[PDB]
Amino acid sequence: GTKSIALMGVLIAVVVVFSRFFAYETTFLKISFTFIPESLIGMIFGPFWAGIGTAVADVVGMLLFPKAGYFPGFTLNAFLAGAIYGYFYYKKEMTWQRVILATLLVTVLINIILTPLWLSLMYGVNLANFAWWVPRLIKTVIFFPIQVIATYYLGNKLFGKPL
Amino acid sequence: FGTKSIALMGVLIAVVVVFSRFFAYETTFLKISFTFIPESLIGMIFGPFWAGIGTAVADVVGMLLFPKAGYFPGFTLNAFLAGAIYGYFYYKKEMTWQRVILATLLVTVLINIILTPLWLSLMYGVNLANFAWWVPRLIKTVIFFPIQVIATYYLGNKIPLFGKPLSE
Ligand SMILES: Nc1nc(=O)c2nc(CNc3ccc(C(=O)N[C@@H](CCC(=O)O)C(=O)O)cc3)cnc2[nH]1
Ligand SMILES: Nc1nc(=O)c2nc(CNc3ccc(C(=O)N[C@@H](CCC(=O)O)C(=O)O)cc3)cnc2[nH]1
């Protein structure tokens, strides 16, 4: 489907933009707004194609802007986001309950279980430092509210040609 | 030098004990107290230092009564810190979003995550970190922190103050 493809291209483009220019990016933390386009992309296109949508959005991301370095497991992250967004959100009506438990399953399962894993995995980390976790946990706990408010709102301002 | 501070405080300590022992969720290694509401009132009423001692003793009568689960000091070290934090942010200064958040944040990080699991380390003996030994904890801290910024903020902006503020 073309129409779907145009949409996808633009959306992949926006995800790239968020991660691209307006994130807080430092060596062991990024603060971006890369959750918003991806949940719209989860809503329109559903789990598998939101998954692929965002995974390739990441790889386009690093092919363009590589200085950060490429680590495989981060693109798995992208994919999971898509699937999760899509699976919770495509396409039941947004419910505080479920903007909430999507958003939880994303924060606990990709942000504190896995991203610390990747860096640990191929950056040399003394995981043992649990003063390593303090910015990560300040953040992990501050932005969940932001994320939930924003997602709810976006969720509740026909989607397009998705599937 | 307190004639009524003692009586009313006794009453608040009692509220704390009930909220703590009678009314809230628990299992080994984790809990949701809803004692932040009365312990934050004491931040608001008593300034930091007494609120700290206030809830420290609220803990210890808490355990004079309600013996099983033993007594462990560093938990009452938590209790004094909670009191003192709510005391420092909420007494004599307006409670706004910008500061309910930074109190609830310092209690949460410094006590619920830096310190409490560190006492659970010594008593029950599981020192090591486990993905996901922690996790029910982290689930609880990240789901519930908004509940406290939305409950103590509203504690700070009320429902039917009437008589006299910030002295009583
Ligand atoms: N494939 C790949 N894509 C990337 O964009 C990438 N970027 C970096 C640059 N370094 C970083 C910096 C921060 C975080 C990080 O803390 N990520 C949080 C996201 C928080 C948010 O978006 O709000 C995470 O949990 O993943 C990861 C890698 C390194 N390898 C990569 N590898
Ligand atoms: N001194 C003392 N005070 C207590 O309140 C106490 N309570 C118990 C009962 N067992 C438990 C069970 C759970 C938690 C607990 O995890 N408390 C945490 C909840 C988690 C969090 O920090 O978010 C807390 O908030 O205090 C403490 C004691 C045993 N010894 C004590 N000893």
Author numbering:
A (entry chain A): 7 to 163, 169 to 174
B (entry chain B): 6 to 165, 169 to 176
From the primary publication:
Harnessing the energy of ATP hydrolysis, ECF transporters are responsible for micronutrient uptake from the environment. ECF transporters are composed of four subunits, two cytoplasmic ATPases EcfA and EcfA', and two transmembrane proteins namely EcfS for substrate recognition and EcfT for energy coupling. The most striking divergence, setting ECF transporters apart from the canonical ABC importers, lies in the substrate-binding proteins; the former utilize integral membrane proteins (EcfSs) for substrate binding, while the latter employ periplasmic solute-binding proteins to capture substrate. Here we report the structure of the EcfS protein of a folate ECF transporter from Enterococcus faecalis-EfFolT in complex with its substrate folate.
There are six EfFolT molecules in one asymmetric unit. The overall structure of EfFolT is similar to the reported structures of EcfS proteins (RMSD of 1.5–3.3 Å) which consist of six transmembrane helices (SM1-6, transmembrane helices 1–6 of EcfS) that form a helix bundle. A pocket with the depth of 24 Å and volume of 1,230 Å3 is formed by the six transmembrane helices near the periplasmic side and is covered by the L1 loop from top. The folate molecule adopts an ‘L'-shaped conformation, with the pterin moiety forming the short arm and the aminobenzoate and glutamate moieties forming the long arm. The recognition of folate is mainly through the pterin and glutamate moieties by a number of residues protruding from SM1, L1 loop and SM3-6. Specifically, the pterin ring of folate forms π–π interactions with the parallel side chain of Phe80. The pterin N2 atom forms two hydrogen bonds with the side chains of Asp64 and Thr81, the N3 atom forms a hydrogen bond with the carboxyl oxygen of Asp64, and O4 atom forms two hydrogen bonds with the guanidine group of Arg26. Specifically, the O1 and O2 atoms of glutamate group form four hydrogen bonds with the side chains of residues Asn117, Thr121 and Arg142; and the OE1 and OE2 atoms form two hydrogen bonds with the side chains of Lys36 and Lys145. In EfFolT, the L1 loop covers on the substrate-binding pocket and adopts a ‘closed' conformation, while in LbFolT, the same loop flips away from the pocket and adopts an ‘open' conformation. In the folate-released or free state, the L1 loop adopts an ‘open' conformation to leave the pocket widely open as represented by the LbFolT structure; once folate binds into the pocket, residue Arg26 from the C terminal of SM1, and residue Lys36 from the L1 loop form three hydrogen bonds with folate, which we propose pulls the L1 loop from the ‘open' to the ‘closed' conformation as represented by the EfFolT structure.
